[PDB]
Structures are given as structure tokens and as C-alpha cells.
Amino acid sequence: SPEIGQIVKIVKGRDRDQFSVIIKRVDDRFVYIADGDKRKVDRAKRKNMNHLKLIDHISPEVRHSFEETGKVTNGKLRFALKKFLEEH
RNA sequence: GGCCAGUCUGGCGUUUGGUGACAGCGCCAAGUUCUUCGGAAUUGGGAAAUCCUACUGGCC
């Protein structure tokens, strides 16, 4: 099952072939994603899990942001995705 | 495999919408119908839907 702060690669939709971050879990089928750059948290995108590829990387920055504040900022989403690309 | 609900000429751009196929807006291209021959108007197949191919979402 998906986790808050987990990296996904979008496989369907107009934003396909981008990496994004799961920022909310609705149920086991639907989540919300955002990247803090072109898709910011105030425009988070509803996605069927079948249209994402789960990646084995959860950003601690995003996960810690939600643990301490219940939210995530656009700056932390951008930083998490940038760190993911560099390491992986 | 079965059923329900969807999408429509091809291409690419887009921090627009859509879970998605896609759509919107844009321009490029093809077919077709026009022309004042500069350029306009259109759009899967089919005479037709409770039809069909392809594709998408859900259920079994």
C-alpha cells in the first residue's frame, strides 16, 4: 500500500513520465500527488493508483513534514524530488 | 473470458480540466466539402442504433 512521501512515476495522464510525490491517501485505489513546482499542493492531482508506478523511495523530508505539521510545503516537495533524482 | 460505463481524423505545445482513454485552447498535417483560388468549413467506420473496430475506467 502507498505511503505519504513516497515517490511515484506517473504512467497515464497528461503529466505522464514525470516523477511526483504522494501527499495524501484517500483509500487503497486513490491518492493525491504534487511536486511543488508545476503541480503545487494547492492544485494536487487525484490519481488512480493503477496510473502510477510506486518507487521504493520515501522522502523523509516529506514524511517528517506531515508528522510535525499535518501538511507539506511546495519547497519540501521540490527538494525531495531533486534529492531523489540525484541519488537514484 | 463476461458485463456496465466511457473516448474519437493524425501530430506536437500547454503550471487548463479529466482516475483515465482523452478533452479544452493553440498551431502543424491529412481526408472531405466550398472558393472571391489569397483562403475558408469540417472530422473514426456505417444507410442506421439498443451497431462496429481501436482504446480507457469500474464490476465479476
Q: Residue ranges per domain, chain A?
A: 6-87
A45 touches strand B (CB under 7 A): yes
C-alpha cell at A66: 506531515
Experimental structure resolution, Å: 2.1
Instruction: Pick out the nucleotide with least CA–C1' distance to A12.
Output: B20
List all residues 6 or more positions away from A52 whose beta carbon is below 8 Å from its beta carbon: A8, A9, A10, A11, A20, A22, A31, A33
Give the residue nearest to nucleotide B14 (CA to C1'). Answer: A14
Which residues, in sequence order, are bridge partners of residue A20?
A8
A26 touches strand B (CB under 7 A): no
Does the domain made of A6-87 have the CATH classification 2.30.30.30?
Answer: yes
List all residues 6 or more positions away from A6 whose beta carbon is below 8 Å from its beta carbon: A21, A22, A54, A55, A57, A58, A59
Method underlying the structure: X-ray
Side chain identity at A23, as an amino acid letter?
A: I
CB atoms inside a 10 Å sphere around CB A77: 27
